[PDB]
């Protein structure tokens, strides 16, 4: 028996295919993430990344923070998770600034591609409100 | 019979012709120089038997009467030691009074104002003092005279030279043959049963009928002298039966199976010696027993003549997995075809096994009177982490000569070997990942101490007063190892070391051993430990793995194992070859090394080390400052490293000031060594051709070009030169500071 | 006609379908192991073998292993993406160590090299010495 | 692309054509030394600059000479 | 050059970071750059002796204006032997509470002692107040202006 | 070995033991022990666990110095074909890893050449060389004032 052998069938193309690349659990998974699932707009693409990331952005900032003993530990660091999303989509909006080039064609049968202009910026809006949105949920959620 | 002897006759005439032609071993250097790198090539060359000659079994013959050359060396060296303790120490003095009297064998001339160095130790006796625990290893033996020590001087010259005959005679009169060498399953029977087991036997015997009875007088309090003659045990059982009563009964409760009988002699106490804070001879008088049985029972696992046993080839190739593939098959002849291949795997157990040596020798201590000679116990540690350090790096240096010049490709298809080639980017980029987070971790942990602790926020600090880090997996160990003795170990008396616990030894008046607890300080250091290991094996493995190509160079195999480069094209080629791989990661050991031998000489100093008085008041060397001192770097720098300095810099005008000159010498030497690294040989060729001009304005230039040192012999010079400075420096920072102490 | 291979993590990566890809071909009489330049091992298959790699030398450096060491010889082929292919070595069917009637001169000097001009002489110009 | 030069001291030995690791250059007729053959160097786009090829030229001093020059993706080696 | 150096065609071609790393290193050696010059060389060292010439009344100006807003010169006039001068004041948000304690040692905020010997300088040439300095700082801005 | 020497004459000039240097100059061990030694008491007691002063800052600057330099090290002794095959593993990782897929370097990651990391590791050595010393000079003189 063996458990690894050349990616699509072809052995000269660098990469293994291994229990850990191509096994039932890793696609069914990976094809479930919002990152790939098929039938998502752009925006909800991001939205639901933010959504699952700013929630738990959260807990270092609480913790492990310079006002964490204090009366104002929550609000200390609530500030400072936003400050860092603030910095993660001024990434977001750089790298598509110039990774994608503008369309001339009015042409646009596939309005929801993600790897375009148009997309990734309503994917990288879609990140800022669902971390922002996290951010305040978990506010709610420790102020118990 | 597969197993036989075949030896040929007169192989090699014994003549001083060859003596007379430097360079005769290789095809290119026996022309004569024309350069002054000739000289350099004739060096580098010697023992590098496989480019010599293209016959395995020439290769072969040359490799086992050099063996026969370095036991001769040694031989010589141990005589030396013995004669040096016979003629020039002061054993005797020592022997009365080991709490008082300082060890030494060397003794200096007094010629140019050197006499100094003669420290007053004691017992009307003038000299250097050693720290190599000669004395400790002697009294063990139960030696007490010297007359003793001058037999084994004598033993020692006589194997010396039974040596060098023996590496005369095999490899000009009697060289065997390549079907003796390639006899793996009788060569494995021979070293565990006889190098091994009887060589356990035959030492549990010395233990139990000479140096047993002769270390309970001495521990008892006779004189040296009223202990009778060493053979006087062997004849009068009424002397043997005084110290052990189970010698009535003789040999007929070892026949009859009544092993118990012997409970007097073969003992499984544990603990130390309470009078010498040594381990109970009575201890490893059993166990040399249970590992010489455990070794000849070993040495029937292989099949040479007769049908019983196992073929180390059936074994291997039977293991083989559904990941895989063929598995073990093909290393047979790799292991049987290539002396490189060999090395790689003994020069890393070699060097793993000192490591291990050095890390049992502090914690159970097994000579007597070592334990509270903690220059003796700080040398002996460091120096088997440094040989352990150099030996491990080597073994990847040979697995590396091996994929360059013994691997095929035909030998191996889709075993092991091929196919960790086949997924050897992963190996690398996942290992480098770990390194990147190993650092940032570990180092970051101080950087945080230092930053919070000089913006005047202690309370923020990763320590045992605020953010803490507990080794709960260690702390978890240690009460395990505590509670061991009567439940886990219900025939132990007492715990194998007093590391994980217990009581407090001492002798006179010095402790030899205490618990060592762990804490968020220890945590961090055991990170350093692990991350310097790690980035030192990423550069040795990415050596070994791609010694035969890259998509850098598709033809490194080609270029072999020791080239500067490829050029400056492709960007930069420089220190490509595997070698320079194993020339970068020899400045990772010296790393890893060195902070390992700063956390043990520290921790050892701050939190058992020290003297005590009335009501067990204990009073450390450095007073505990290890758990808020070593969180931070600049903890580290003026607590350790400027602290401690004190004695090696105040050395002057007394008798341990050769460890000031030497310290100063090194640190000379380690700054020399930055002219070879950091520059490189066009630019010291260039100005040789100025100097070799003024020779030739004045008609004269020696006809061997001068030529400066080539790119890959420029390195080895520098890093030759910075382990020499660097290692040094500590070596004299290290004596001078544990000889004031002790 | 791809040899026998079970595949490594050394082969092409993006740059092959993105940039130029090549491929090599060979005739071997018969089946024997080979070492890969990305990778360990091979078997190569009787009649014609191709193997795709992803730069010249890679490729180069299978034929000159091929060569000495097992007395065959091959052809090497530049892939664009669209799909247009260019024929490499050897450029007209002839090893380039041997004289081929019909080659012509490419960057030559008609002088030796201590011949060359002062880079002062050739100031405020977009050139260089070696290129006068 | 890198810039490879070869002067007129040519011997036509064809060491530096052996040399090569990536078919820069070949030996083309020539009348003007014993060997009637001097090298060329037709395709210096696929030079990588790693001067094998001087390191492998007889004469004194070389004929065959490698500049530096601007680098593409095949000067630089990538196989990414 | 239509890359990031647009004065080397032959440093804007190239696909690798090495691009970004040498159009910073090679940006001042004005003499190799894509079709310059002998005469627009000289133009463009001549208007940058003039830039660098403003940085340096810049530095000055600085220096001159934390004293007069921050330092201790008319305390130190007054006392020159007993006084410690002030290079200028720290506001650094990652500072403990010891720490503002430490650099305000007989001070009333937190505060770097100066160093440069400015004080001793300023004193014998005429200086005796914190509206001298400070008008001086005025005039080198508009001299770096000019 | 200039400012070394100006300092030390001084600091035992000002300490008003001048005969201290006079003796202890003649062989190199005085150098190390009365001079870097003894007079960075006040520098490395900086900051410490008991608590900080306001040299805490130069102390801190002091270690600053020695990782600058010795981080300089590793641009001087290990060379480039070492980092260009490390690279190429980690350009193939980022290519496989989903999820980090969707991003992509614009311009392709390369070892720094050879000339480049001879300016980086020099440029590292020297600051770090600078600040260390600015570091001790500084403090050991204001800790003892004299
Ligand atoms: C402490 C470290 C150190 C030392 C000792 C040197 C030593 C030297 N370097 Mg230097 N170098 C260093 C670091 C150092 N380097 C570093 C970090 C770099 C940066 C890469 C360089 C870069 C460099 C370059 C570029 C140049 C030098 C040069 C020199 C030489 C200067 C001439 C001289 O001093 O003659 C004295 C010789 C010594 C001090 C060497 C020690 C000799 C000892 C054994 C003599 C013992 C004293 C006494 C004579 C004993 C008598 C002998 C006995 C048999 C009777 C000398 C060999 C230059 C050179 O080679 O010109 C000649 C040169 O051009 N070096
Ligand atoms: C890398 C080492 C290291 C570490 C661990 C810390 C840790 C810390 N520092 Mg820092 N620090 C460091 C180096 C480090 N420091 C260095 C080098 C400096 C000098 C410049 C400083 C200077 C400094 C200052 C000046 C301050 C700190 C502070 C802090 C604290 C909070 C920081 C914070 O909220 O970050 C935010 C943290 C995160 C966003 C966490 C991200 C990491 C997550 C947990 C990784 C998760 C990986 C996950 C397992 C992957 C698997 C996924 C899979 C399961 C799906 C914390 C104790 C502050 C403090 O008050 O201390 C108490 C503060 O004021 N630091
Ligand atoms: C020189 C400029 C500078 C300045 C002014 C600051 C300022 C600050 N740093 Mg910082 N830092 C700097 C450089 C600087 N840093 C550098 C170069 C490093 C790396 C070596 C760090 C590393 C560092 C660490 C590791 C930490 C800080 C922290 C802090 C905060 C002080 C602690 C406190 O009481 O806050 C407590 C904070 C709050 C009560 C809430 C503040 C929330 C902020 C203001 C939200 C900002 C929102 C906005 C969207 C940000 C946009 C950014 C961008 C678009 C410009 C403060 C905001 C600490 C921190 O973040 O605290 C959480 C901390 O842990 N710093
Ligand atoms: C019982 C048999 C026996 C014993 C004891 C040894 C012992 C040894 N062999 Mg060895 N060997 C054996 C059988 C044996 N071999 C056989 C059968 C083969 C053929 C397959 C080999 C092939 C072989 C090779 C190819 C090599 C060795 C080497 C070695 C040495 C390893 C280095 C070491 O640990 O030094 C420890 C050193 C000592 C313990 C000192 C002992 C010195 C001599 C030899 C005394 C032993 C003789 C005798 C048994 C003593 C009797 C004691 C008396 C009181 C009764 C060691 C001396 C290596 C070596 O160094 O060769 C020189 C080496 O390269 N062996
Ligand atoms: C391997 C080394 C070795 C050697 C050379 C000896 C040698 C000896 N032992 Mg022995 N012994 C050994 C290991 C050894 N022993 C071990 C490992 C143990 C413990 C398991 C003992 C336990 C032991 C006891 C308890 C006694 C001896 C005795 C003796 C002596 C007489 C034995 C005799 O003639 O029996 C005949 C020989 C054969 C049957 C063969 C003789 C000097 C006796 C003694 O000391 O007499 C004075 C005695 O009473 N031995
Ligand atoms: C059992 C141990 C062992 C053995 C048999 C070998 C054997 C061999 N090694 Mg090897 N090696 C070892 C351990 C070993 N090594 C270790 C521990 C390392 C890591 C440091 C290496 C690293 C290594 C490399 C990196 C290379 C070898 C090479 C070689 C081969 C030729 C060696 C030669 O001609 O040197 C001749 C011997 C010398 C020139 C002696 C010089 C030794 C140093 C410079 C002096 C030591 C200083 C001294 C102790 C103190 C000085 C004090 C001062 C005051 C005077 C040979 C097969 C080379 C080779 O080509 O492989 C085929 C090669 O490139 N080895
Ligand atoms: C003090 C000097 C020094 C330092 C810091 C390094 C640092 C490093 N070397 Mg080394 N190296 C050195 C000397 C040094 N080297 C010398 C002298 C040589 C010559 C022999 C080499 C030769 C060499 C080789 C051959 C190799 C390395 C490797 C490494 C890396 C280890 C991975 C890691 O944990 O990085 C993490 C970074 C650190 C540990 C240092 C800083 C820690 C910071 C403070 C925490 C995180 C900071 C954060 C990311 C940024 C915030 C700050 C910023 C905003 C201001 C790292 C970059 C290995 C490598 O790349 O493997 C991965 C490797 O193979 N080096
Ligand atoms: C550790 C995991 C472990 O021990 O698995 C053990 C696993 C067992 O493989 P096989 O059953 O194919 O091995 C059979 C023979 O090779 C045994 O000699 O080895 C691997 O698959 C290697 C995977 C690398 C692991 C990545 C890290
Ligand atoms: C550890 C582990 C693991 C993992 C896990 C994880 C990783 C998890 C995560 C989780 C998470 C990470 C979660 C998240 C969540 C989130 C949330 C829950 C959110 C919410 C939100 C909301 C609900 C909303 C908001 C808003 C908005 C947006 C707007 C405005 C308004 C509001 C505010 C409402 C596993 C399994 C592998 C295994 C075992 C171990
Ligand atoms: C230190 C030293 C030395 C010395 C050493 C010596 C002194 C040794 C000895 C050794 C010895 C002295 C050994 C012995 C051996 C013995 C043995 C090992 C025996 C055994 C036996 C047995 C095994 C038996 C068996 C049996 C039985 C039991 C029963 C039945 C029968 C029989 C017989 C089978 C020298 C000089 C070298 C050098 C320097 C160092
Ligand atoms: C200094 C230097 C040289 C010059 C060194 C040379 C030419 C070797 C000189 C060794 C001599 C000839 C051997 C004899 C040693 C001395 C004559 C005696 C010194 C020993 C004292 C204890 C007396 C290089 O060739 C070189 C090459 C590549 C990288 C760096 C460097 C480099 O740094
Ligand atoms: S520089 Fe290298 S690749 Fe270019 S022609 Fe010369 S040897 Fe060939
Ligand atoms: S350049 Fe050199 S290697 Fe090439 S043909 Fe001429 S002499 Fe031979």
């Known amino acids: ?144 | ?742 | ?132 | 692309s890198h810039s490879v030069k070869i002067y007129d001291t040519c011997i036509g030995c064809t060491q530096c054509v052996r040399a090569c690791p990536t078919d820069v250059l070949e030996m083309i007729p020539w009348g003007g030394c014993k060997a009637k053959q001097i090298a060329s160097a037709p395709r210096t786009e696929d030079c990588v600059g790693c001067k094998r090829c001087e390191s492998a030229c007889p004469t004194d001093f070389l004929s065959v000479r490698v500049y530096l020059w601007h680098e593409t993706t095949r000067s630089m080696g990538l196989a990414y | ?146 | ?146």
């Open chain 1, 1 to 144: 028996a063996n458990f690894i052998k050349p990616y699509n069938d072809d052995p000269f193309v660098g990469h293994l295919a291994t229990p850990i690349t191509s096994s039932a659990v890793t696609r069914s998974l990976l094809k479930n993430l919002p990152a790939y699932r098929f039938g998502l707009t752009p925006l909800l693409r991001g939205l639901e990344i933010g959504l699952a990331h700013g929630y738990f952005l959260i807990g270092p900032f609480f913790k492990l923070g310079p006002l964490r003993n204090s009366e104002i530990a929550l609000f200390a660091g609530f500030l400072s998770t936003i400050g860092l999303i603030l910095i993660l989509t001024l990434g977001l909006t750089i790298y598509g600034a110039v990774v994608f080039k503008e369309e001339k064609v009015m042409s646009s049968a596939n309005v929801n591609n993600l790897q375009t202009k148009k997309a990734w910026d309503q994917f990288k809006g879609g990140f800022f409100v669902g971390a922002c949105g996290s951010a305040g949920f978990a506010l709610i959620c420790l102020y118990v």
């Open chain 6, 1 to 146: 070995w200039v400012t070394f020497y100006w300092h030390w004459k001084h600091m035992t000039i000002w300490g008003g033991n001048p005969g201290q240097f006079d003796e202890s100059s003649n062989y190199i061990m005085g150098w190390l022990r009365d001079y870097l030694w003894l007079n960075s008491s006040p520098l490395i007691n900086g900051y410490n666990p008991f608590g900080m002063n306001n040299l805490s800052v130069w102390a801190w600057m002091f270690l600053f110095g020695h990782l600058i330099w010795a981080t300089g090290f590793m641009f001087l002794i290990s060379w480039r074909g070492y980092w260009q095959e490390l690279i190429e593993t980690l350009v193939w990782a980022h290519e496989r890893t989903p999820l980090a897929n969707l991003i992509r370097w614009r311009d392709k990651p390369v070892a720094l050449s050879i000339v480049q990391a001879r300016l980086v590791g020099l440029v590292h050595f020297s600051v770090g060389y600078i600040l260390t010393y600015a570091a001790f000079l500084i403090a050991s003189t204001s800790g003892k004032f004299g």
């Open chain 3, 1 to 132: 006609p791809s040899p026998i291979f079970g595949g490594s993590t050394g082969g092409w990566l993006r740059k092959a379908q993105v940039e130029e890809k090549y491929v090599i071909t060979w005739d071997s009489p018969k089946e024997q192991i080979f070492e890969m330049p990305t990778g360990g091992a091979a078997i190569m298959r009787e009649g014609p073998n191709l193997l795709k790699l992803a730069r010249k030398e890679q490729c180069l450096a299978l034929g000159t292993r091929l060569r000495s060491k097992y007395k065959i010889k091959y052809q090497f082929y530049r892939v664009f993406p669209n799909g247009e292919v260019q024929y490499l070595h050897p450029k007209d069917g002839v090893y380039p160590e041997k004289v081929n009637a019909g080659r012509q001169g490419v960057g030559q000097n008609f002088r030796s090299i201590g011949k060359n001009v002062s880079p002062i002489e050739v100031k405020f110009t977009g050139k260089q010495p070696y290129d006068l």
């Open chain 2, 1 to 742: 019979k597969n197993v036989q002897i075949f030896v040929e006759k007169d192989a090699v005439e014994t003549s001083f012709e060859k003596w007379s032609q430097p360079g005769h071993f290789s095809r290119t250097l026996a022309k004569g120089p024309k350069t002054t790198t000739w000289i350099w090539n004739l060096h580098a060359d010697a023992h590098d038997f496989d480019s010599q000659t293209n016959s395995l079994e020439e290769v072969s013959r040359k490799i086992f009467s050099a063996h026969f050359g370095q036991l001769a060396a040694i031989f010589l060296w141990i005589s030396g030691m013995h004669f040096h303790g016979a003629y020039f120490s002061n054993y005797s003095a020592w022997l009365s009074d080991p709490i008082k009297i300082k060890q030494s064998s060397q003794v200096v001339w007094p010629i140019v104002g050197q006499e100094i160095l003669n420290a007053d130790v004691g017992g009307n006796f003038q000299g250097v003092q050693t720290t190599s625990g000669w004395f400790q290893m002697w009294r063990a033996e139960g030696i007490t005279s010297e007359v003793e020590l001058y037999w084994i001087a004598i033993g020692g010259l006589i194997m010396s030279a039974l040596m060098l005959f023996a590496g005369w005679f095999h490899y000009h009169k009697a060289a065997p043959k390549l079907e003796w060498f390639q006899n793996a399953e009788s060569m494995m029977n021979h070293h565990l049963a006889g190098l091994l087991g009887l060589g356990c036997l035959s030492w549990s015997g010395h233990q139990i009928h000479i140096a047993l009875p002769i270390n309970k007088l001495l521990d008892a309090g006779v004189s040296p002298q009223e202990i009778p003659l060493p053979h006087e045990f062997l004849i009068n059982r009424d002397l043997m039966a005084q110290l052990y009563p189970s010698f009535e009964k003789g040999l007929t409760p070892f026949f009859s199976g009544q092993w118990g009988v012997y409970s007097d002699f073969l003992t499984f106490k544990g603990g130390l010696n309470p009078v010498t804070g040594g381990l109970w001879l009575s201890d490893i008088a059993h166990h040399h027993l249970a590992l010489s049985v455990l070794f000849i029972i070993a040495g029937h696992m292989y099949r040479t003549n007769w049908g019983i046993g196992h073929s180390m080839k059936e074994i291997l190739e039977a293991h083989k997995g559904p990941f895989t593939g063929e598995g073990h098959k093909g290393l047979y002849e790799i292991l049987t075809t290539s002396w490189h291949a060999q090395l790689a795997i003994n020069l890393a157990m070699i060097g793993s096994l000192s490591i291990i040596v050095a890390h049992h020798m502090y914690a159970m201590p097994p000579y007597p009177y070592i334990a509270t000679d903690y220059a003796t116990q700080l040398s002996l540690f460091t120096h088997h982490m440094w040989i352990g350090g150099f030996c491990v790096v080597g073994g990847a240096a040979h697995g590396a000569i091996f994929m360059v010049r013994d691997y095929t490709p035909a030998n191996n298809y889709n075993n092991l070997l091929d196919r960790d080639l086949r997924h050897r980017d992963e190996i690398i980029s996942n290992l480098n990942w770990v390194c990147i987070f190993l650092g940032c971790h570990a180092f970051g942990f101080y950087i945080h101490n230092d930053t919070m602790r000089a913006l005047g926020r202690p309370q923020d600090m990763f320590s045992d007063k605020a953010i803490q880090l507990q080794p709960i997996f260690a702390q978890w160990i240690q009460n395990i190892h505590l509670l061991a003795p009567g439940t886990t170990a219900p025939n132990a008396l007492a715990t194998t070391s007093y590391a994980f616990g217990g009581d407090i030894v001492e002798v006179g008046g010095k402790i030899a051993m205490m618990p060592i607890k762990l804490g968020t300080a220890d945590f961090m250091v055991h990170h350093i430990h692990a991350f310097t290991i790690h980035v030192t094996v990423l550069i040795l493995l990415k050596g070994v793995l791609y010694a035969r190509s890259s998509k850098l160079i598709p033809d490194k195999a080609n270029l072999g194992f020791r080239f500067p480069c490829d050029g400056p094209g492709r960007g930069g080629t420089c220190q490509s070859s595997s070698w320079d791989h194993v020339f970068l990661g020899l400045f990772w050991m010296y790393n890893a090394i060195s902070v390992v031998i700063f956390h043990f000489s520290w921790k050892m100093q701050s939190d058992v080390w020290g003297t005590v008085t009335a009501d067990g008041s204990i009073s450390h060397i450095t007073g505990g400052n290890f758990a808020q001192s070593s969180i931070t770097i600049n903890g580290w720098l003026r607590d350790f490293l400027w602290s401690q300095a004190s004695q090696v810099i105040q050395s002057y005008g007394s008798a341990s000031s050769a460890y000031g000159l030497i310290f100063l010498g090194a640190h000379f030497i380690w700054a020399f060594s930055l002219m070879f690294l950091f520059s490189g040989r066009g630019y010291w060729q260039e100005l040789i051709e100025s100097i070799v001009w003024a020779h030739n304005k004045l008609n004269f230039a020696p006809a061997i070009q001068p030529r400066a040192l080539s790119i890959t012999q420029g390195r080895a010079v520098g890093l030759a030169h910075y382990l020499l400075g660097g290692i040094g420096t500590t070596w004299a920072f290290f004596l001078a500071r544990s000889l004031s102490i002790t």
């Open chain 5, 1 to 146: 050059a239509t890359k990031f150096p647009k004065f080397s065609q032959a440093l804007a071609q190239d696909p690798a970071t090495r691009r970004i790393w040498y159009g910073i290193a090679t940006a001042h050696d004005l003499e190799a750059h894509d079709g310059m010059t002998e005469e627009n060389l000289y133009q463009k060292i001549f208007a940058s002796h003039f830039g660098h010439l403003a940085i340096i009344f810049l530095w000055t100006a600085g220096n001159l204006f934390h004293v007069a807003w921050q330092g201790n010169f008319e305390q130190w006039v007054a006392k020159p032997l007993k006084t410690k001068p002030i290079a200028h004041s720290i506001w650094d948000p990652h500072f403990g509470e010891s720490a503002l304690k430490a650099f305000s040692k007989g001070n009333t905020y937190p505060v770097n002692i100066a160093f440069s010997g400015v004080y001793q300088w300023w004193y014998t040439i005429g200086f005796r107040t914190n509206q001298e300095l400070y008008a001086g700082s005025i005039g080198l801005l508009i001299l770096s202006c000019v």
